[PDB]
């Protein structure tokens, strides 16, 4: 089985890997999270704040029996002229993640190929096209209700707060302008994720578990559903905090 993680950046982040630049994707250029990373802050949350058995934490992450993927963007916010920002995404992000759902073992709706145009939700639209930043972007009309299908994939993912988060601040961008953004509107001050990203990772049970093991994951990890973390350096200065989410995939 698999569970299946939200994290929503509440405050500008640096995780991991502070003059030096985020982690990177070494082909795509996409920021992530490090499943190495990720498993620590887990692991010592579950520890110095759920107050876990420290002997239930090595039967589950080692001193193991689970697998912590590294977090990947799904959407990431952008300055926009109407709305006042939007939860920016795209196709090989939106592929990427359904790929990850069918690893998991699960989001049967054909995601369109996008170059020079955009869909969006109509609250972030300035007719007729979504203005990010610097580019005005060329809307096409949704006619095969993707936005709906992926408002409720958000909402099976990762719950109703979310989907409501992003509802109607939602756009659907080219590939490399989703790139170019993530890139270039980074929070800088030095360099930070910002603080309305939404990264998914995926944590898998190693196939030789019984249900007892299952069992124990299942109430360790539920522990973490809606809860409040701190990944990357510069806690002290506010940075880092994210909102994480849990689910059992069917």
Known sequence: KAYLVGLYTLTPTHPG??????????????????????KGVLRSYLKLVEKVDEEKINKIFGPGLISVGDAKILFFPVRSLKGVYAYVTSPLVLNRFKRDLELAGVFQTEIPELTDTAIASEEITVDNKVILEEFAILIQKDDK?????????????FGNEMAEKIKGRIAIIPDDVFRDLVELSTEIVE??????????????????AKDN??????????????????????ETVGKGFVKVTLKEVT
Request: a negative charge; aromatic letters at 8%; zero cysteines.
């Open 145 to 157: 209700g993707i936005l709906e299908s992926v408002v409720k994939a958000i909402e099976q993912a």
């Open 17 to 38: 890997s502070v003059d030096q630049p985020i982690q990177r994707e070494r082909h795509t250029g996409f920021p992530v999270i490090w499943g190495q990373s990720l």
């Open 191 to 208: 360099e930070y994720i910002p603080s309305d990203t939404l990264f998914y990772s995926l944590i898998l049970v190693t196939p030789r």
């Open 213 to 234: 093991d299952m069992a124990l994951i299942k109430e360790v990890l539920g522990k973490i559903n809606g809860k409040y973390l701190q990944i990357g350096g510069n």
